[PDB]
């Protein structure tokens, strides 16, 4: 159970910067085993984009949580930042706040000033782990 580069290259067939997107995607899914590349429609049935869906390990108050996220890579990735969302399961609820809006969209200085090649997905996830470690984007349903 693993995704080969061939399957990835196919997903980003319509992207403007293919090799760059594939390279970073491989780097991300190798380090973060619970993130998986998925090709799905975004907003319109004709608008297919690849996203990384799954969880990332976030330490909070002495315990590690698998925070559910979805990172949509635009067809202009890595020159434009990904559009990121928290994806709560039925057992949790989104915590609207400083870094999460009403739709679950994530806001971070790293995304706001995103600039290739200094900015990348590995750096973005590292930031998320730190920021969400201070303020979780989701909490369980008590």
């Amino acid at each position: 159970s693993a995704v080969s580069e061939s399957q990835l290259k196919k997903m980003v067939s319509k992207y403007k910067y293919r090799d760059l997107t594939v390279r970073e995607t491989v780097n991300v899914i190798t380090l973060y085993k619970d993130l998986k590349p998925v090709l799905d429609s975004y907003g319109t049935g004709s608008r297919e984009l690849m996203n990384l869906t799954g969880t990332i390990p976030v330490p909070y108050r002495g315990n590690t949580y698998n925070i559910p996220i979805c990172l949509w890579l635009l067809d202009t990735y890595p020159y434009n930042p990904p559009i990121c969302f928290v994806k709560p399961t039925s057992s949790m609820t989104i915590k609207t706040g400083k870094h999460v809006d009403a739709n679950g969209k994530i806001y971070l200085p790293y995304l706001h000033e995103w600039k290739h090649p200094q900015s990348d997905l590995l750096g973005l996830i590292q930031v998320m782990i730190v920021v969400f470690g201070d303020e979780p984007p989701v909490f369980s349903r008590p």
Binding site: T55, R61, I67, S91, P136, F139, S140, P142
Partner: peptide
């Protein structure tokens, strides 16, 4: 492996 979240606090 499985999505988890901390309790309110």
């Amino acid at each position: 492996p499985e999505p988890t979240a901390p309790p309110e606090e």
